[PDB]
Amino acid sequence: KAKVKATLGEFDLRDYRNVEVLKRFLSETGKILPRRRTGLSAKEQRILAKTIKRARILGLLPFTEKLVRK
Amino acid sequence: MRRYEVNIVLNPNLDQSQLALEKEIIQRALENYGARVEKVEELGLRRLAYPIAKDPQGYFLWYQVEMPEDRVNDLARELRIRDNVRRVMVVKSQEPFLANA
Amino acid sequence: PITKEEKQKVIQEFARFPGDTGSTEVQVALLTLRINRLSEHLKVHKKDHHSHRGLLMMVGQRRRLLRYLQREDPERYRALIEKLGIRG
Amino acid sequence: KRQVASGRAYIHASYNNTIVTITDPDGNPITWSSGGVIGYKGSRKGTPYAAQLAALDAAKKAMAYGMQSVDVIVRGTGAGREQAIRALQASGLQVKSIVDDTPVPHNGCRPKKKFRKAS
RNA sequence: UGAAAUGCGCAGAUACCGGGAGGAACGCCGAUGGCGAAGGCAGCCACCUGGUCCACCCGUGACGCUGAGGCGCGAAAGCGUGGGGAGCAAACCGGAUUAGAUACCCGGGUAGUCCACGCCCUAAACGAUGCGCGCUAGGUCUCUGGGUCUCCUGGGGGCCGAAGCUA
Ligand SMILES: NC[C@@H]1O[C@H](O[C@H]2[C@@H](O)[C@H](O[C@@H]3[C@@H](O)[C@H](N)C[C@H](N)[C@H]3O[C@H]3O[C@H](CO)[C@@H](O)[C@H](O)[C@H]3N)O[C@@H]2CO)[C@H](N)[C@@H](O)[C@@H]1O
Ligand SMILES: [Mg+2]
Ligand SMILES: [Mg+2]
Ligand SMILES: [Mg+2]
Ligand SMILES: [Mg+2]
Ligand SMILES: [Mg+2]
Ligand SMILES: [Mg+2]
Ligand SMILES: [Mg+2]
Ligand SMILES: [Mg+2]
Ligand SMILES: [Mg+2]
Ligand SMILES: [Mg+2]
Ligand SMILES: [Mg+2]
Ligand SMILES: [Mg+2]
Ligand SMILES: [Mg+2]
C-alpha cells in the first residue's frame, strides 16, 4: 500500500519513548513491519527494530496483538 | 564518566508518601554511585501495552545523567531491589538519528 | 578502553622529537600499552579466545618492530626495552 | 443453571478435531462440544462437517443457559475453522467479534520431529 | 493416523480463565543482509575486549611476504567431575504397518541435548578453490565510508559478461 515513512515528518528513530510514532511501524499484530511496508533504508530499519525492542521492554509497546475479525 | 539514560517504571497506585520516598531512595542511589543528573523528565502515568506486575499501567521516570561506567551495572542492581520499582532500563546516550530531514 | 589523553601522554613520553607519532620507539610503546590492557582482560576472561588472537598479532608485530630496531640502532633498542621492561 | 446472556466462544481447530467451548465473559466455561461429542470418532472428528455440528451443538447447549451473543476467539488452523465460525454465526446465537489468538512461541521449545520439518 | 491402536480421561482428562514453579530457546525485524581466520555468531541492557573500513596525507623509513616444526583455536557426537533437566530424544518399553519390519508412522522413554571446569580434535571443517602482491573491458543489483552528494571516489556481498583460460 502506501509507505509508513512517507506518512511522517522528521523523527528521531533512536527515540525509544515516542510510542506514538513507533506504533505505526507495528502491524495490527504488534509485529515489526518489513521494509516493503515501512519504506525504510536498511540502516534505518536496523535502528528501528532496536528501539522498537526497547519500547517493548519498557512496557510502552506490544510484543503481540490478536487479529480482529478473521 | 559516560553519559547514560535511566528509565524507571513505577507502581501507578502510589501517593506522595511512597512516590516521593521512592524518588529520593533513587536520588540517594544515583548520588551514591556517582551520578550527576543533567536533564530529567516525568511523563508519570501512562497506559502500558501489556500488564507489568499484574497492573495495566505504569509511572515513568527518565533521567539523563553523566556517571562512572565501572559502576553503572551496580547502580542498576540497586534500583530494582525495591518493590514498587518495576522496570529499570539504563541506556547509553545517543546522538539522535533522524529520518525525513 | 584507552582514552586519547592516556594515549597522548604515552606518545609524548617516547617520541624522538616533538611531533613523532609514528616510529619504532613510539609504536613499540603504544603496542606495549595495549598488550598490557589486553593481557589484563584475558587474565580474567580465560574463555575470551577471540580477543586472545588480537594479542598474538600485537605481540608478534611488536616483536617484529623490535627485531628491526635492534638491528638498526642497538643502543636505542636496549634503551626502549629497558624503559618498558620486556624481552628477557 | 445460571442465566448469562453473552460470553465467549473459544474455537480450537487442530488437524485432528475442532473443539468449541463456550464461556461467560470472564472465561469460565458454560458448555462445550467437540467432534467426538457428536457421533464422530477417529479421523472424522477432523472434518469441517464435524466442526459445524459441534459449533451448533455447543451453541444449542449455551442457549439453554439463555445465551444471546458471543465474542468468538479462534485458535489453531484446521479444516473445521471457518466452518465452525460460519456455524456460530448462523445459529441464532449472535457473533459480536471474531479474533485469531493462536498461541505461538517467540521461538522457544524444540518441536517433535514431525513439526520440525522446517529445519 | 492412510486407517488405527497403544496411551491418557469419572482420583474428572481434553477445551477455557486466574495464580505459581522451572528449563530451554529467542517470533516479527530478517535480507538475494552483516560480522569473524576458520569453526562459527541473532531478545534487550551495561561493563570488558578482538578485528576492520573511510578522510587528512601528519609521523617511522623496506621495519616486508610466506612459513617445515612448535604453540593456540577448532560444529556435532562422545568422555570425566559436579550441577541442572522444561521440551526434544539414540538406546530401550509399547502400538501400528508388513510376507517379515530388529525401520519408515503413533504412544512412552534413559544417556544426551543445558551450565561450569577439565578432556576429545573429528567433519560434505566446502567456495569441495593455500596465503600475499601486481597486471588485464564493461554493465547491473546490494551492504558500508568520503566528496563539489545529477554524478564521482574507497571497502565488502551478488548477478551478467571483454580479453583470456577450461576436458
Ligand atoms: N542470558 C544470560 C547470559 O548468558 C551467558 O551464560 C549464562 C547463562 O546464559 C546460563 O544460563 C542461565 C543460568 O545463568 C541460570 N543458572 C539458570 C538460568 N535458567 C539460565 O538462564 C539463561 O539461559 C537459559 C538458556 O536457555 C535461559 O533461562 C535463558 O535463555 C537465559 N535467561 O548460565 C550462564 C551463567 O550462569 C553469559 N555467561 C552471560 O552473558 C549471561 O549470563
Ligand atoms: Mg482425530
Ligand atoms: Mg495457566
Ligand atoms: Mg558455515
Ligand atoms: Mg608524510
Ligand atoms: Mg627523512
Ligand atoms: Mg570440539
Ligand atoms: Mg557438544
Ligand atoms: Mg557430560
Ligand atoms: Mg516400533
Ligand atoms: Mg517416538
Ligand atoms: Mg515424546
Ligand atoms: Mg564465490
Ligand atoms: Mg565490488
mmCIF file of all heavy atoms in Angstrom, chain A residues 5 8-14 16-17 19-20 54 56-63, chain B residues 5 7 41 43 46 48-50 60 62 87 89 91 94-101:
data_model
loop_
_atom_site.group_PDB
_atom_site.id
_atom_site.type_symbol
_atom_site.label_atom_id
_atom_site.label_comp_id
_atom_site.label_asym_id
_atom_site.label_seq_id
_atom_site.Cartn_x
_atom_site.Cartn_y
_atom_site.Cartn_z
ATOM 1 N N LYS A 5 6.836 5.534 6.199
ATOM 2 C CA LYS A 5 7.836 6.602 6.232
ATOM 3 C C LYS A 5 7.254 7.852 5.605
ATOM 4 O O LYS A 5 7.374 8.943 6.164
ATOM 5 C CB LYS A 5 9.092 6.175 5.449
ATOM 6 C CG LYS A 5 10.253 7.168 5.434
ATOM 7 C CD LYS A 5 11.289 6.784 4.381
ATOM 8 C CE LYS A 5 12.386 7.828 4.252
ATOM 9 N NZ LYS A 5 13.031 8.115 5.567
ATOM 10 N N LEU A 8 4.986 10.505 7.540
ATOM 11 C CA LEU A 8 5.523 11.166 8.726
ATOM 12 C C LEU A 8 6.531 12.214 8.343
ATOM 13 O O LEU A 8 7.110 12.160 7.255
ATOM 14 C CB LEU A 8 6.228 10.158 9.624
ATOM 15 C CG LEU A 8 5.390 9.005 10.154
ATOM 16 C CD1 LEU A 8 6.298 7.943 10.748
ATOM 17 C CD2 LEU A 8 4.409 9.526 11.187
ATOM 18 N N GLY A 9 6.760 13.152 9.258
ATOM 19 C CA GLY A 9 7.816 14.146 9.101
ATOM 20 C C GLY A 9 9.119 13.623 9.665
ATOM 21 O O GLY A 9 9.353 12.420 9.691
ATOM 22 N N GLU A 10 9.974 14.529 10.118
ATOM 23 C CA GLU A 10 11.196 14.119 10.775
ATOM 24 C C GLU A 10 10.827 13.440 12.095
ATOM 25 O O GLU A 10 9.753 13.701 12.645
ATOM 26 C CB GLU A 10 12.169 15.297 10.985
ATOM 27 C CG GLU A 10 11.664 16.448 11.862
ATOM 28 C CD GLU A 10 12.789 17.194 12.584
ATOM 29 O OE1 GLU A 10 13.934 17.223 12.069
ATOM 30 O OE2 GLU A 10 12.530 17.745 13.678
ATOM 31 N N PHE A 11 11.696 12.539 12.557
ATOM 32 C CA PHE A 11 11.576 11.898 13.872
ATOM 33 C C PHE A 11 12.847 11.130 14.189
ATOM 34 O O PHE A 11 13.398 10.447 13.322
ATOM 35 C CB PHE A 11 10.402 10.922 13.919
ATOM 36 C CG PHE A 11 10.458 9.853 12.861
ATOM 37 C CD1 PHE A 11 10.810 8.549 13.187
ATOM 38 C CD2 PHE A 11 10.152 10.159 11.535
ATOM 39 C CE1 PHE A 11 10.857 7.574 12.206
ATOM 40 C CE2 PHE A 11 10.192 9.194 10.552
ATOM 41 C CZ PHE A 11 10.548 7.900 10.885
ATOM 42 N N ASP A 12 13.299 11.231 15.434
ATOM 43 C CA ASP A 12 14.494 10.524 15.878
ATOM 44 C C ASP A 12 14.133 9.061 16.073
ATOM 45 O O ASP A 12 13.420 8.721 17.016
ATOM 46 C CB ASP A 12 15.015 11.132 17.191
ATOM 47 C CG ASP A 12 16.211 10.378 17.767
ATOM 48 O OD1 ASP A 12 16.983 9.818 16.965
ATOM 49 O OD2 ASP A 12 16.388 10.345 19.013
ATOM 50 N N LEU A 13 14.606 8.180 15.199
ATOM 51 C CA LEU A 13 14.232 6.778 15.357
ATOM 52 C C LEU A 13 15.204 6.045 16.270
ATOM 53 O O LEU A 13 15.193 4.827 16.361
ATOM 54 C CB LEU A 13 13.944 6.058 14.029
ATOM 55 C CG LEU A 13 14.861 6.007 12.807
ATOM 56 C CD1 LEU A 13 14.095 5.353 11.659
ATOM 57 C CD2 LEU A 13 15.336 7.374 12.364
ATOM 58 N N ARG A 14 16.016 6.815 16.982
ATOM 59 C CA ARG A 14 16.733 6.346 18.160
ATOM 60 C C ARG A 14 15.826 6.520 19.383
ATOM 61 O O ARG A 14 16.154 6.066 20.487
ATOM 62 C CB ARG A 14 18.008 7.184 18.343
ATOM 63 C CG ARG A 14 19.126 6.531 19.143
ATOM 64 C CD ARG A 14 20.035 5.721 18.231
ATOM 65 N NE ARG A 14 20.915 6.560 17.415
ATOM 66 C CZ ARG A 14 21.659 6.111 16.406
ATOM 67 N NH1 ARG A 14 21.650 4.821 16.060
ATOM 68 N NH2 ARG A 14 22.417 6.960 15.736
ATOM 69 N N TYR A 16 13.233 5.823 21.749
ATOM 70 C CA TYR A 16 12.532 4.646 22.218
ATOM 71 C C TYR A 16 11.401 4.990 23.128
ATOM 72 O O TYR A 16 10.853 4.105 23.774
ATOM 73 C CB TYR A 16 13.480 3.720 22.967
ATOM 74 C CG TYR A 16 14.140 4.313 24.174
ATOM 75 C CD1 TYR A 16 13.629 4.104 25.445
ATOM 76 C CD2 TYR A 16 15.307 5.055 24.042
ATOM 77 C CE1 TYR A 16 14.266 4.628 26.554
ATOM 78 C CE2 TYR A 16 15.943 5.590 25.137
ATOM 79 C CZ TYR A 16 15.428 5.375 26.383
ATOM 80 O OH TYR A 16 16.111 5.929 27.426
ATOM 81 N N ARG A 17 11.072 6.274 23.215
ATOM 82 C CA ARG A 17 9.955 6.710 24.030
ATOM 83 C C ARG A 17 8.794 7.239 23.215
ATOM 84 O O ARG A 17 7.671 7.204 23.684
ATOM 85 C CB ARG A 17 10.438 7.686 25.083
ATOM 86 C CG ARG A 17 11.137 6.936 26.206
ATOM 87 C CD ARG A 17 11.231 7.796 27.441
ATOM 88 N NE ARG A 17 12.225 8.853 27.263
ATOM 89 C CZ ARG A 17 12.090 10.111 27.672
ATOM 90 N NH1 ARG A 17 10.979 10.520 28.278
ATOM 91 N NH2 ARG A 17 13.075 10.970 27.464
ATOM 92 N N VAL A 19 6.257 6.496 21.543
ATOM 93 C CA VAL A 19 5.368 5.375 21.174
ATOM 94 C C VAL A 19 4.292 5.710 20.149
ATOM 95 O O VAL A 19 3.629 4.820 19.627
ATOM 96 C CB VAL A 19 4.605 4.759 22.380
ATOM 97 C CG1 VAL A 19 5.439 4.789 23.656
ATOM 98 C CG2 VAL A 19 3.260 5.440 22.604
ATOM 99 N N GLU A 20 4.084 6.991 19.910
ATOM 100 C CA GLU A 20 3.010 7.455 19.057
ATOM 101 C C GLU A 20 3.457 7.201 17.635
ATOM 102 O O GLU A 20 2.689 6.718 16.803
ATOM 103 C CB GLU A 20 2.749 8.953 19.288
ATOM 104 C CG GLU A 20 2.340 9.337 20.717
ATOM 105 C CD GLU A 20 3.453 9.205 21.769
ATOM 106 O OE1 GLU A 20 4.632 8.978 21.400
ATOM 107 O OE2 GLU A 20 3.145 9.320 22.983
ATOM 108 N N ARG A 54 13.270 -1.826 22.450
ATOM 109 C CA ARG A 54 13.424 -1.144 23.742
ATOM 110 C C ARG A 54 12.077 -0.744 24.311
ATOM 111 O O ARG A 54 11.804 -0.989 25.474
ATOM 112 C CB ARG A 54 14.331 0.081 23.621
ATOM 113 C CG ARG A 54 15.793 -0.262 23.830
ATOM 114 C CD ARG A 54 16.710 0.443 22.853
ATOM 115 N NE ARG A 54 18.011 0.681 23.468
ATOM 116 C CZ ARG A 54 18.751 1.766 23.270
ATOM 117 N NH1 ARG A 54 18.349 2.740 22.442
ATOM 118 N NH2 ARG A 54 19.903 1.880 23.915
ATOM 119 N N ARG A 56 9.215 -1.963 23.810
ATOM 120 C CA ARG A 56 8.561 -3.166 24.259
ATOM 121 C C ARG A 56 8.930 -3.558 25.678
ATOM 122 O O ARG A 56 8.038 -3.864 26.473
ATOM 123 C CB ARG A 56 8.851 -4.320 23.311
ATOM 124 C CG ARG A 56 8.030 -4.288 22.038
ATOM 125 C CD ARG A 56 8.396 -5.492 21.215
ATOM 126 N NE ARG A 56 7.740 -5.522 19.918
ATOM 127 C CZ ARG A 56 8.074 -6.364 18.948
ATOM 128 N NH1 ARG A 56 9.069 -7.232 19.127
ATOM 129 N NH2 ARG A 56 7.420 -6.340 17.801
ATOM 130 N N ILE A 57 10.215 -3.543 26.014
ATOM 131 C CA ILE A 57 10.616 -3.940 27.361
ATOM 132 C C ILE A 57 10.175 -2.901 28.386
ATOM 133 O O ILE A 57 9.786 -3.222 29.512
ATOM 134 C CB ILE A 57 12.120 -4.128 27.456
ATOM 135 C CG1 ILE A 57 12.564 -5.239 26.511
ATOM 136 C CG2 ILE A 57 12.508 -4.499 28.875
ATOM 137 C CD1 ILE A 57 14.066 -5.395 26.451
ATOM 138 N N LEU A 58 10.214 -1.646 27.968
ATOM 139 C CA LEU A 58 9.706 -0.535 28.759
ATOM 140 C C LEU A 58 8.204 -0.615 29.020
ATOM 141 O O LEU A 58 7.694 0.121 29.838
ATOM 142 C CB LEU A 58 10.001 0.767 28.019
ATOM 143 C CG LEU A 58 10.768 1.845 28.778
ATOM 144 C CD1 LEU A 58 11.794 1.266 29.740
ATOM 145 C CD2 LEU A 58 11.429 2.783 27.766
ATOM 146 N N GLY A 59 7.497 -1.486 28.311
ATOM 147 C CA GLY A 59 6.083 -1.681 28.511
ATOM 148 C C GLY A 59 5.321 -0.788 27.556
ATOM 149 O O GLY A 59 4.100 -0.914 27.399
ATOM 150 N N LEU A 60 6.040 0.105 26.891
ATOM 151 C CA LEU A 60 5.406 1.108 26.056
ATOM 152 C C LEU A 60 4.852 0.564 24.756
ATOM 153 O O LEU A 60 3.945 1.170 24.202
ATOM 154 C CB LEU A 60 6.403 2.200 25.717
ATOM 155 C CG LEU A 60 7.005 2.946 26.897
ATOM 156 C CD1 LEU A 60 8.057 3.898 26.365
ATOM 157 C CD2 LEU A 60 5.927 3.687 27.671
ATOM 158 N N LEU A 61 5.415 -0.540 24.252
ATOM 159 C CA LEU A 61 4.942 -1.172 23.005
ATOM 160 C C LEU A 61 4.647 -2.672 23.158
ATOM 161 O O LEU A 61 5.279 -3.355 23.954
ATOM 162 C CB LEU A 61 5.981 -0.981 21.904
ATOM 163 C CG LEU A 61 6.059 0.390 21.247
ATOM 164 C CD1 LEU A 61 7.187 0.405 20.226
ATOM 165 C CD2 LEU A 61 4.740 0.758 20.583
ATOM 166 N N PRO A 62 3.698 -3.197 22.373
ATOM 167 C CA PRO A 62 3.360 -4.612 22.456
ATOM 168 C C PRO A 62 4.375 -5.529 21.782
ATOM 169 O O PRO A 62 4.954 -5.167 20.765
ATOM 170 C CB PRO A 62 2.049 -4.693 21.683
ATOM 171 C CG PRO A 62 2.176 -3.649 20.649
ATOM 172 C CD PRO A 62 2.954 -2.526 21.296
ATOM 173 N N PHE A 63 4.564 -6.718 22.344
ATOM 174 C CA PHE A 63 5.214 -7.805 21.624
ATOM 175 C C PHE A 63 4.215 -8.490 20.699
ATOM 176 O O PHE A 63 4.629 -9.065 19.701
ATOM 177 C CB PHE A 63 5.746 -8.849 22.567
ATOM 178 C CG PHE A 63 6.794 -8.350 23.533
ATOM 179 C CD1 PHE A 63 6.436 -7.742 24.719
ATOM 180 C CD2 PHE A 63 8.151 -8.576 23.290
ATOM 181 C CE1 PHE A 63 7.408 -7.343 25.612
ATOM 182 C CE2 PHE A 63 9.122 -8.180 24.186
ATOM 183 C CZ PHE A 63 8.752 -7.560 25.346
ATOM 184 N N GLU B 5 21.172 7.115 30.309
ATOM 185 C CA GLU B 5 19.731 7.437 30.308
ATOM 186 C C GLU B 5 19.058 6.369 31.136
ATOM 187 O O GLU B 5 19.123 5.193 30.803
ATOM 188 C CB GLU B 5 19.117 7.447 28.892
ATOM 189 C CG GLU B 5 19.336 8.753 28.122
ATOM 190 C CD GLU B 5 18.758 8.780 26.697
ATOM 191 O OE1 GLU B 5 17.612 8.333 26.470
ATOM 192 O OE2 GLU B 5 19.454 9.290 25.788
ATOM 193 N N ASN B 7 15.765 4.864 32.632
ATOM 194 C CA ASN B 7 14.309 4.775 32.660
ATOM 195 C C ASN B 7 13.881 3.956 33.811
ATOM 196 O O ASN B 7 14.374 2.843 33.979
ATOM 197 C CB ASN B 7 13.781 4.111 31.433
ATOM 198 C CG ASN B 7 14.187 4.836 30.216
ATOM 199 O OD1 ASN B 7 13.397 5.583 29.629
ATOM 200 N ND2 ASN B 7 15.455 4.679 29.850
ATOM 201 N N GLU B 41 12.983 14.020 33.268
ATOM 202 C CA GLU B 41 11.630 14.086 32.750
ATOM 203 C C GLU B 41 10.758 13.143 33.532
ATOM 204 O O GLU B 41 11.244 12.248 34.223
ATOM 205 C CB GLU B 41 11.576 13.704 31.274
ATOM 206 C CG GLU B 41 12.287 14.687 30.365
ATOM 207 C CD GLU B 41 12.186 14.299 28.909
ATOM 208 O OE1 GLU B 41 11.047 14.074 28.441
ATOM 209 O OE2 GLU B 41 13.248 14.209 28.245
ATOM 210 N N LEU B 43 6.858 11.860 32.588
ATOM 211 C CA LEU B 43 5.541 11.783 31.981
ATOM 212 C C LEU B 43 4.625 11.098 32.975
ATOM 213 O O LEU B 43 3.404 11.197 32.874
ATOM 214 C CB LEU B 43 5.578 11.045 30.636
ATOM 215 C CG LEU B 43 6.163 11.870 29.474
ATOM 216 C CD1 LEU B 43 7.689 11.933 29.511
ATOM 217 C CD2 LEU B 43 5.686 11.327 28.133
ATOM 218 N N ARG B 46 0.988 6.385 32.561
ATOM 219 C CA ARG B 46 0.788 6.039 31.145
ATOM 220 C C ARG B 46 0.330 4.598 30.976
ATOM 221 O O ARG B 46 0.632 3.731 31.816
ATOM 222 C CB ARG B 46 2.070 6.255 30.339
ATOM 223 C CG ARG B 46 2.140 7.594 29.613
ATOM 224 C CD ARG B 46 3.578 8.038 29.392
ATOM 225 N NE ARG B 46 4.156 7.431 28.192
ATOM 226 C CZ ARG B 46 3.946 7.852 26.945
ATOM 227 N NH1 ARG B 46 3.159 8.895 26.693
ATOM 228 N NH2 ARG B 46 4.528 7.223 25.937
ATOM 229 N N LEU B 48 0.291 1.015 29.726
ATOM 230 C CA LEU B 48 1.206 0.001 29.233
ATOM 231 C C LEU B 48 0.564 -0.826 28.153
ATOM 232 O O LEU B 48 -0.667 -0.927 28.086
ATOM 233 C CB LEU B 48 1.613 -0.922 30.350
ATOM 234 C CG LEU B 48 2.327 -0.210 31.493
ATOM 235 C CD1 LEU B 48 2.879 -1.252 32.466
ATOM 236 C CD2 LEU B 48 3.430 0.732 31.014
ATOM 237 N N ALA B 49 1.409 -1.420 27.316
ATOM 238 C CA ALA B 49 0.951 -2.191 26.160
ATOM 239 C C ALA B 49 0.561 -3.603 26.570
ATOM 240 O O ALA B 49 -0.204 -4.270 25.895
ATOM 241 C CB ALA B 49 2.039 -2.237 25.105
ATOM 242 N N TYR B 50 1.118 -4.049 27.680
ATOM 243 C CA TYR B 50 0.752 -5.308 28.277
ATOM 244 C C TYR B 50 0.945 -5.071 29.772
ATOM 245 O O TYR B 50 1.741 -4.216 30.149
ATOM 246 C CB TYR B 50 1.678 -6.415 27.767
ATOM 247 C CG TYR B 50 3.147 -6.053 27.888
ATOM 248 C CD1 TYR B 50 3.872 -6.382 29.021
ATOM 249 C CD2 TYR B 50 3.800 -5.351 26.884
ATOM 250 C CE1 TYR B 50 5.213 -6.039 29.151
ATOM 251 C CE2 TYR B 50 5.145 -4.999 27.004
ATOM 252 C CZ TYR B 50 5.848 -5.342 28.148
ATOM 253 O OH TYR B 50 7.178 -5.006 28.292
ATOM 254 N N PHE B 60 6.311 6.660 34.845
ATOM 255 C CA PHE B 60 7.566 6.720 34.086
ATOM 256 C C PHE B 60 8.517 7.853 34.434
ATOM 257 O O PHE B 60 8.278 9.021 34.103
ATOM 258 C CB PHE B 60 7.277 6.804 32.596
ATOM 259 C CG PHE B 60 6.810 5.526 32.018
ATOM 260 C CD1 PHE B 60 5.499 5.385 31.596
ATOM 261 C CD2 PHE B 60 7.676 4.453 31.910
ATOM 262 C CE1 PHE B 60 5.055 4.186 31.066
ATOM 263 C CE2 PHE B 60 7.244 3.255 31.377
ATOM 264 C CZ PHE B 60 5.933 3.115 30.958
ATOM 265 N N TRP B 62 12.502 9.202 33.833
ATOM 266 C CA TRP B 62 13.550 9.220 32.846
ATOM 267 C C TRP B 62 14.551 10.235 33.328
ATOM 268 O O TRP B 62 14.196 11.366 33.568
ATOM 269 C CB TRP B 62 12.989 9.641 31.500
ATOM 270 C CG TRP B 62 14.028 9.788 30.468
ATOM 271 C CD1 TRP B 62 14.443 8.841 29.605
ATOM 272 C CD2 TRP B 62 14.795 10.961 30.185
ATOM 273 N NE1 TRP B 62 15.420 9.341 28.787
ATOM 274 C CE2 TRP B 62 15.659 10.645 29.126
ATOM 275 C CE3 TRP B 62 14.833 12.250 30.722
ATOM 276 C CZ2 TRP B 62 16.552 11.569 28.587
ATOM 277 C CZ3 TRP B 62 15.718 13.163 30.193
ATOM 278 C CH2 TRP B 62 16.566 12.820 29.134
ATOM 279 N N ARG B 87 10.522 -1.586 36.584
ATOM 280 C CA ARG B 87 11.443 -1.691 35.469
ATOM 281 C C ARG B 87 12.520 -0.640 35.557
ATOM 282 O O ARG B 87 12.230 0.545 35.686
ATOM 283 C CB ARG B 87 10.693 -1.502 34.174
ATOM 284 C CG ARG B 87 9.966 -2.739 33.725
ATOM 285 C CD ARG B 87 10.825 -3.717 32.927
ATOM 286 N NE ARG B 87 9.965 -4.260 31.889
ATOM 287 C CZ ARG B 87 9.009 -5.163 32.093
ATOM 288 N NH1 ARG B 87 8.813 -5.698 33.294
ATOM 289 N NH2 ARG B 87 8.255 -5.555 31.073
ATOM 290 N N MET B 89 15.669 0.489 33.148
ATOM 291 C CA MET B 89 16.493 0.296 31.949
ATOM 292 C C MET B 89 17.514 1.443 31.747
ATOM 293 O O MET B 89 17.171 2.536 31.257
ATOM 294 C CB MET B 89 15.606 0.090 30.710
ATOM 295 C CG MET B 89 16.289 -0.681 29.582
ATOM 296 S SD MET B 89 15.992 0.062 27.962
ATOM 297 C CE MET B 89 14.537 -0.827 27.414
ATOM 298 N N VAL B 91 20.653 3.121 29.877
ATOM 299 C CA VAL B 91 20.966 3.127 28.445
ATOM 300 C C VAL B 91 22.007 4.222 28.100
ATOM 301 O O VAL B 91 21.897 5.348 28.552
ATOM 302 C CB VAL B 91 19.640 3.250 27.639
ATOM 303 C CG1 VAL B 91 19.761 4.102 26.378
ATOM 304 C CG2 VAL B 91 19.124 1.872 27.304
ATOM 305 N N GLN B 94 22.697 8.820 23.149
ATOM 306 C CA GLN B 94 22.983 8.669 21.748
ATOM 307 C C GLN B 94 22.526 9.849 20.935
ATOM 308 O O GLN B 94 21.406 10.346 21.099
ATOM 309 C CB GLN B 94 22.331 7.393 21.209
ATOM 310 C CG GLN B 94 23.289 6.214 21.013
ATOM 311 C CD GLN B 94 22.584 4.974 20.470
ATOM 312 O OE1 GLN B 94 21.731 4.386 21.146
ATOM 313 N NE2 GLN B 94 22.933 4.574 19.240
ATOM 314 N N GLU B 95 23.402 10.285 20.032
ATOM 315 C CA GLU B 95 23.043 11.335 19.116
ATOM 316 C C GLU B 95 21.777 10.858 18.435
ATOM 317 O O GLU B 95 21.665 9.687 18.072
ATOM 318 C CB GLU B 95 24.163 11.637 18.116
ATOM 319 C CG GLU B 95 25.236 12.576 18.667
ATOM 320 C CD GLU B 95 26.225 13.070 17.609
ATOM 321 O OE1 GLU B 95 25.802 13.390 16.476
ATOM 322 O OE2 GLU B 95 27.438 13.156 17.911
ATOM 323 N N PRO B 96 20.793 11.749 18.321
ATOM 324 C CA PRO B 96 19.524 11.379 17.697
ATOM 325 C C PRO B 96 19.635 11.089 16.190
ATOM 326 O O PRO B 96 19.784 12.008 15.394
ATOM 327 C CB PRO B 96 18.633 12.609 17.951
ATOM 328 C CG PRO B 96 19.578 13.741 18.201
ATOM 329 C CD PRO B 96 20.804 13.141 18.816
ATOM 330 N N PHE B 97 19.561 9.823 15.798
ATOM 331 C CA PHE B 97 19.486 9.510 14.372
ATOM 332 C C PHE B 97 18.098 9.861 13.843
ATOM 333 O O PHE B 97 17.134 9.230 14.249
ATOM 334 C CB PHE B 97 19.793 8.027 14.093
ATOM 335 C CG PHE B 97 20.005 7.736 12.633
ATOM 336 C CD1 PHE B 97 21.279 7.717 12.094
ATOM 337 C CD2 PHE B 97 18.920 7.549 11.781
ATOM 338 C CE1 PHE B 97 21.463 7.492 10.738
ATOM 339 C CE2 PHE B 97 19.096 7.318 10.427
ATOM 340 C CZ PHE B 97 20.370 7.292 9.904
ATOM 341 N N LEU B 98 17.986 10.841 12.945
ATOM 342 C CA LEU B 98 16.654 11.281 12.449
ATOM 343 C C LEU B 98 16.402 10.847 11.022
ATOM 344 O O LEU B 98 17.324 10.426 10.349
ATOM 345 C CB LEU B 98 16.413 12.797 12.612
ATOM 346 C CG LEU B 98 17.526 13.704 13.147
ATOM 347 C CD1 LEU B 98 18.651 13.890 12.131
ATOM 348 C CD2 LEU B 98 16.939 15.043 13.557
ATOM 349 N N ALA B 99 15.146 10.927 10.581
ATOM 350 C CA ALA B 99 14.729 10.465 9.243
ATOM 351 C C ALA B 99 13.662 11.394 8.660
ATOM 352 O O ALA B 99 12.797 11.867 9.394
ATOM 353 C CB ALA B 99 14.188 9.049 9.317
ATOM 354 N N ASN B 100 13.709 11.611 7.341
ATOM 355 C CA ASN B 100 12.923 12.661 6.661
ATOM 356 C C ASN B 100 13.395 14.047 7.088
ATOM 357 O O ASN B 100 12.614 14.825 7.640
ATOM 358 C CB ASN B 100 11.408 12.538 6.909
ATOM 359 C CG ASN B 100 10.839 11.224 6.426
ATOM 360 O OD1 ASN B 100 11.171 10.751 5.344
ATOM 361 N ND2 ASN B 100 9.962 10.631 7.226
ATOM 362 N N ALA B 101 14.673 14.339 6.835
ATOM 363 C CA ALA B 101 15.298 15.619 7.208
ATOM 364 C C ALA B 101 15.042 15.998 8.675
ATOM 365 O O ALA B 101 14.756 17.150 8.991
ATOM 366 C CB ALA B 101 14.837 16.734 6.270
#
